[PDB]
Amino acid sequence: FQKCPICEKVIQGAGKLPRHIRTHTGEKPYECNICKVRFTRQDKLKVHMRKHTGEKPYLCQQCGAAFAHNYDLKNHMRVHTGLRPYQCDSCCKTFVRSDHLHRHLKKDGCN
DNA sequence: ATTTGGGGAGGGGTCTTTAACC
DNA sequence: GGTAAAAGACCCCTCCCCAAAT
Ligand SMILES: [Zn+2]
Ligand SMILES: [Zn+2]
Ligand SMILES: [Zn+2]
Ligand SMILES: [Zn+2]
Incomplete structure (x- = not known):
């Protein structure tokens, strides 16, 4: 489908290229307001x-x-x-x- | 001493739902 | 409401690490 602009890896996920692009920064923008644990992605935060x-x-x-x-x-x-x-x-x-x-x-x- | 079982983080895929424009 | 995306929700996997079991 679409290649990553940085590492040129093929991302077959439909509409998932920005999600992969965010992997290269190493940041965890999602945080649990209770225990202060930070997460990379929102779904993991919800499961937590x-x-x-x-x-x-x-x-x-x-x-x-x-x-x-x-x-x-x-x-x-x-x-x-x-x-x-x-x-x-x-x-x-x-x-x-x-x-x-x-x-x-x-x-x-x-x- | 070594192997098993599980917690808790990550990433990549598919199906649905939604936010942005028009 | 239609369109073309990204987000959500959920699936699967591996990794480090450490009790627990053997
Ligand atoms: Zn990349
Ligand atoms: Zn928490
Ligand atoms: Zn074997
Ligand atoms: Zn049962």
Whole structure:
């Protein structure tokens, strides 16, 4: 789509080029008025504000448990399914978060 | 000692909603 | 109201770091 004017990286996001351009300045223009923590983007600030408000918009359809984050809901759903979602293609290990599998592939030879 | 599980920050994509002009 | 954008809301991922578990 459109290339970044600075680093010439292709930004496929529709209307997301200014958002990427703001990444090069390193500033955090969004701030939580309560705990004074600064954020780069507004959506992260709202998800953080869920921490102060106590809002838990993610609902489990089987037991009604509520969570503030989508990944919390998934990791909880594995209590009903018992399924570890990420599996290594080479060493038979399984993991509960994607970055755990990435870390395993980065560290262990595995093959 | 080493591996797992999770908190909390970042970035990039898509779908919808909206702010700016006209 | 129409148009062409950016913002919002939400999805996914990785990273550092540190308890916790093994
Ligand atoms: Zn750039
Ligand atoms: Zn806060
Ligand atoms: Zn449940
Ligand atoms: Zn492996």
